Design a protein around this nucleic acid. Structure first.
Lengths: 481, 481, 481
RNA sequence: AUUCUCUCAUAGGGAUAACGGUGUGGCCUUCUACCUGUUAGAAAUAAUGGGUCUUCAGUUGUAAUUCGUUGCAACUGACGGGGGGGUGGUGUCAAAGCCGUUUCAACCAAGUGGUAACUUACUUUUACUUGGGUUUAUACCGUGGAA
RNA sequence: AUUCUCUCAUAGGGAUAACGGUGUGGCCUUCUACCUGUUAGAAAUAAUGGGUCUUCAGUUGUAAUUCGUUGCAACUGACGGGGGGGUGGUGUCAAAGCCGUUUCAACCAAGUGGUAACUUACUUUUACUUGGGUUUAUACCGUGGAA
RNA sequence: AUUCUCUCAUAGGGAUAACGGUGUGGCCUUCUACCUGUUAGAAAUAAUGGGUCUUCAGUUGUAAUUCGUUGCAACUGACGGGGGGGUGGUGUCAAAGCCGUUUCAACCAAGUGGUAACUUACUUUUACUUGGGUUUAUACCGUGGAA
């Protein structure tokens, strides 16, 4: 098919996607505002709707305008490409200064350039997919865990690349292009050179074409490491190498060092940890040793795999915020006007908080459905929650500790709510749910039923963990994900 | 010969041995009581004779009854064995709870079962003795010491098995039985299965048959280690491996780890020390290092072999107790009735104490006999003392320190005795041996002679050490032991 | 040619050299005394001339007497050599007790014996020069630096021989003589045996013949190390071995240890440092690591080569002493009689101090000559100063720090001089050079000119460093040295 | 006599008084961008007396290629430590930190329990002094001779 | 106009006013153990309203084998953190320790020099919401038109 | 009865009263340098009673070789811990340190929060007692018999 048809199709698809998103955004904002008005009574702020700032700078950024004229641009681009005069327009870049990632500048490109880059990247990847080394990182996690279990003592080397994209040398890339027997047409080379453009060093960040170049640069390193006989995995901006012999790990370190010099890239000293030995807890080591290793939010050890501390902190933060927002925040305003005061042993806010916590943790599944699936009465279940992102966890003690934390936090929050209500002049200590001790919370809430459905049940990590383990055993990681 | 004759002979020998022992016990107790009556005067306690408690539980335990009827049991056992209905009776087990060894349960079996086990074990060992890897541990000590001296830097790995006997898997043993081309008759297999009996896991402790099974289980490990090329020695519940290359020691560690998993045995983390480098004192090491290694009460280092600290503590305890018992303990009783008070420059208790110390250290040999043997006037000497258990010691400084300790302790004990005697109302400061200073003790005691024999000489470790070294050089360790 | 002619020539050359030296000594002492008389006025001490004490003990030590009768000695020596009755006379030995080097005894020999030893050593070295392994240590420094830069991680082992000369075993040397296929005539062997003479162990120190023996003893060690594949360098009483594999370094350590036992030499434990890993700063190591290594006054690291701390301390000491001697010391005497007081904005002592510092640092070269050579107006320069001894330094920061130190010390010394002059009763604060602040010292001194030559310029290390680097790049180390 | 001769030659006899070196000057020749005074005298040139510049990395411009980085501008960026006290900004919710002004120290000392001295000196490489050559101009240094 | 047409086509002309989505309900069909009320009406069955169970490891018993661990009972063992104060046992020669009762804290906090706030929020993977399909029932959200 | 016999034989019948060990002495023989008392009686020898020596490393001397270190002198160097207090030298600019005299402690204790007891004892190898042989000299130890 002609170039124009393909360009038109890609531009149309991109515009339709962006429009769709925007529409969902404003509709959700309306629903949330409606709920907030009831929650905060007459102190609720008014609704505000915003449009992205960068849309104003150029008409091309705005999706609707591009949708209006999606034919002229395609023809002009095709003609400019045939004439070999095409050049991508300047991107919009905004820095994100932070302690981690430094400047962490991010760039966004106009819709036509992004569409062209995506099309070319897809074609190149399709033709050259076979000549490449082995969301699929989970299989690597399984392999490393199995190897770690097989022998207690393993040698590990961890390298953290710093400013990998920024320092790539164009001459090195030019050398790679001629060698390795890859298939690249003249037009593709022209487009790649056009994208590099003025930049003296480095490759553009935030573009689809860049990923292919990154894979291309590391082909020789992968071949050399495979020839050596060590095992390795590379994901994002990190690499891990493990072996059972000191000599091989030393040779791998030498190869990595020599490669960095050739390609003008530097390894951050602070982030890099160096060679170490991973051994079971309670056994001495003759060299520097560690008992746990982190990979993509997973903590791996000889005995078991557990969730990383930071993820646990985020989960605790979210649950705490939900409880605070629904129970304590509304009562600290100057005037309690428009709000509903709990009475006759009924509290709506407690129900709303419990439902939101259930949605965050499971996705809305009831305990009965999980039990039925486990027993075998039903054949299917859907996983749509925070737990889905960690399908391979096998540690039981941590989940129990988390469940205890949830129950205690709920009890303390309810007590503080009761104190504030008493301070405002209403005494509701006798009425439920303020009359229940910590030990009795689970059973009393479990028994209570509203409208024939048990909506007061406290969620438990262990039950979902059991369901996940059974699903994994009887199926595959790809099926679950 | 028929089975009955062999069974009869073994049972008779066991009964005669036990009887003999008992008779020696009671006779010795009588002699000791007679001496105690003189030592403690009229405060001496009366003699008490006891019989082992477990004898009462069953008639078979008692030796005399079994001696009375040693024919019927043999015939019945032979018939039951031929019918394949034989089963060993339950053993008597008494726990020994302690910090070291934990429960440390010990079991004793009746005389017929023990005789049967000994007979079968002897036959099996005789037939299968050749297919086994190399009181003979002393030769191993010589070899390791020579290797340690040859090169200053050596790599060592030490593993302490925990509950080795308890956790042996029967399935693994069954697998070993079929393989390895050993010669085992049907009756032997039947007896081994009978001994295992109800036990789900583990092998009986305290029986002769168990040792053969233990050697059988470790055959593959020994073959693999020999194939690797490292050198090792296994005695009791400990193993040592040494080599001059890091790679081999790492491979040996891997082999040991893999074997433990296969045979369901665990290595105690606390007792195990891990890989280390043994180097001469005053030289730095790049990894964890040690300057001394302990083996069966021996401390081995690059420079020399010396006695372990615990053994020295036991020797000090025994010598101190003997001096206290003969010099201080009799004078702290309420009434000094029936005792003899030192007078006219003569003290019997000092003579008795010195003679007991000499018997404990040498075995009763005089200094003259040792000197004659060293010079060559005589051709033979007998070694029967505490020193005999440590025939390879070559450290001279430690022996000198011990001799100084002995002289000082003797002087202090005599001074305390003099003070107590003065407190009771007798002043004997002028009379010997209370008039001698520490420096003059050895010479004055040496010169004094009673009945034409020098009985007041103070024993010296160095002289016996010289005699032992000369005997070892002119003979062999087997001859000395 | 006959033996007599050669002996005569060597003796004559030695005597003429020694005489020459003596004459230069006394003439220099006269000039220095003349300058001192002006510097210290009427407090100057009187001149004293001395002759070496050992000259008195024997007439042979004195050069003039040997020069008077250089013919008889040659004939007598030749006849005694032919008769095989020659024996060297006893040397004069004086101990130099110190913490470093211990007794450090040094021996001096009479002129004829030294001449004979030099002649024989030269002939033996000439014939056997080819059979030897690779002021030439600088090339080794270049090679080690290049290797260190090539790979960041390197393994190093350093051994310090102790009393190497003292403990050499004669039997070992005798064994070496027969083997290795060296060419040694009977007379040479006779002379070597004569030199060893009464000494039971060791070889004489301070004689030319000894060096050849030292090279001869280590031939086997060098061959073995080369066969192993490691790289090494031996200079004076130290050796360094470096490699990129742990196994090879361990084998080299074993070879060195085995050799020492065979040749009865010991390695000092304190001086020896053991195996270590040299890595770039800021990168972790799994074993003992260091970031800098010292060799013959040079400090070598991955980034650059810099001067050792001790040499810097000596340079600081010399510059400080020169400033103190010319500026402060003359004014602390009891009476300022015969001295010249600074007046009319002129100070001779400052000029003398600056000229002496320039002579010590450069050798007298002006800034203009260096600038002309750098630009290319002139083609040649001569290097004759302290800097010449360190021709390979490439560190710039250290030189800048040294220059700042020099300027500050000059300013402080001038201030103290002004205070002392005021204390004596003369106020010269307004007059130069006491009116200049630290910042303005360099420019004001630079501009000032006397007799058409700029003699007040402050020397700078960086300019000479640049000249040295340019000379090295455009020539060779041998040419510069 | 350190100069020259004789034999028994690792030591002994003789005969002559000079024999070895250092500083300064001279001469020979040896690698050197300019701009200006006053002399001389033809600008052939000299003679003297004053002053400025030289490096590295760019940014480009250029050109040139000689197929690369060359030669040029012109641009702009470098190019003389550290320590102890006082007092100002600005840094935060406190703070670190970063800037600037004024004082104290001959050096080791960015430290010792405490801090002064020393170059014919101290000790582990630690060591050398200014293109050469030749100067019976000139003044002096060992040891002799004379006395 | 985000709808539709025209050319010089990354920009320009026109013509019509509608054009994209969200919640709830409906319908279609799609994987589900029982025991009981009241309805209806024949127990063919419906209609609604209430309540219980589901996992893992054993111990065995059993049987069965299908040559092994199967299917069953029945048994008994699991299955919702941590921190600071008070007061009881029991632990020793002192003691650790182990047990139990009562109080304090919205979370990071098992900590900071000190401890409050926040979701259209914060940032390193940090990201998603409830079998589908179709509903001019019904109520609303951008941007237009009318005004 | 632990001694001896019988059968149903991991248990049952009988008949006799002795049956196993320890200390001391005796005898048999077994590897031992001298010098002296008193006995006896011929120095063949005995009998008893008193006292000394034995090792390693040298230095050499020697000799010898047996081609090396041998055998000898003779020389000189070794050969019985540690801790807490007081008081002397000498060590420095202070000091460490090295020497010497006097006191305290039954051992672990060169240490514990604190320090006493114990051998038919305690526990991780921890375990053995004095060339053998034979002694119806002599005195005693289990269990029996008699009573």
């Amino acid at each position: 098919m002609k170039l124009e048809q393909q360009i038109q199709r890609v531009i149309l698809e991109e515009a339709k996607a962006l429009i769709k998103d925007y529409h969902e955004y404003h509709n959700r904002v309306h629903l949330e505002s409606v709920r907030n008005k009831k929650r905060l009574g007459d102190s609720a702020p008014d609704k505000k709707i915003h449009r992205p700032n960068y849309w104003s700078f150029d008409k091309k950024f705005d999706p609707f305008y591009v949708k209006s004229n999606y034919k002229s641009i395609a023809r002009s681009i095709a003609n400019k490409i045939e004439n070999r005069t095409y050049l991508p327009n300047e991107p919009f870049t905004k820095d994100v200064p932070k302690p981690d990632g430094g400047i962490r500048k991010v760039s966004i490109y106009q819709i036509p350039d992004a569409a062209i880059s995506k099309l070319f990247f897809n074609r190149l990847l399709a033709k050259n997919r076979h000549r490449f080394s082995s969301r699929n990182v989970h299989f690597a996690i399984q392999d490393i865990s199995v190897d770690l279990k097989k022998n207690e003592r393993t040698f590990l080397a961890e390298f953290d690349f710093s400013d990998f994209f920024g320092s790539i040398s164009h001459s090195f890339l030019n050398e790679q292009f001629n060698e390795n027997g890859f298939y690249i047409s003249p037009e593709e080379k022209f487009i790649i050179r056009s994208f590099l453009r003025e930049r003296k060093v480095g490759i553009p960040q935030g573009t689809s074409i860049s990923l292919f170049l990154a894979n291309l640069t590391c082909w020789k390193l992968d071949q050399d490491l495979e020839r050596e006989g060590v095992k390795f995995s590379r994901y994002a901006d990190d690499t891990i190498i493990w072996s059972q012999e000191y000599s091989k790990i030393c040779n791998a370190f030498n190869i990595i060092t020599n490669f960095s010099k050739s390609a003008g890239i530097k390894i951050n000293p602070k982030k890099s940890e160096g060679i170490s030995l991973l051994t079971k807890k309670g056994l001495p080591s003759e060299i520097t040793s560690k008992n746990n290793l982190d990979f993509l939010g997973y903590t791996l050890s000889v005995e078991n795999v557990s969730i990383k501390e930071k993820s646990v902190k985020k989960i605790k933060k979210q649950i705490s915020y939900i409880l605070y927002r629904n129970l304590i925040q509304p009562l600290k305003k100057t005037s309690l006007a428009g709000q509903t005061i709990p009475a006759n042993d009924r509290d709506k806010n407690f129900l709303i908080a419990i439902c939101e916590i259930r949605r965050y943790m499971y996705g809305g599944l009831s305990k009965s459905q999980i039990k039925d699936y486990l027993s075998g009465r039903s054949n299917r279940l859907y996983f749509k929650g925070i737990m889905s992102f960690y399908p391979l966890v096998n540690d039981v003690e941590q989940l129990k500790q988390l469940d205890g934390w949830i129950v205690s936090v709920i009890y303390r929050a309810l007590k503080l709510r009761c104190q504030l209500l008493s301070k405002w002049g209403y005494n509701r200590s006798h009425n439920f749910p303020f009359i229940l001790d910590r030990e009795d919370i689970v059973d009393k809430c479990s028994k209570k039923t509203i409208a024939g459905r048990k909506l007061f049940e406290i969620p438990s990590f262990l039950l979902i963990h059991k369901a996940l383990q059974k699903g994994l055993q009887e199926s595959g990681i790809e099926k679950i994900m």
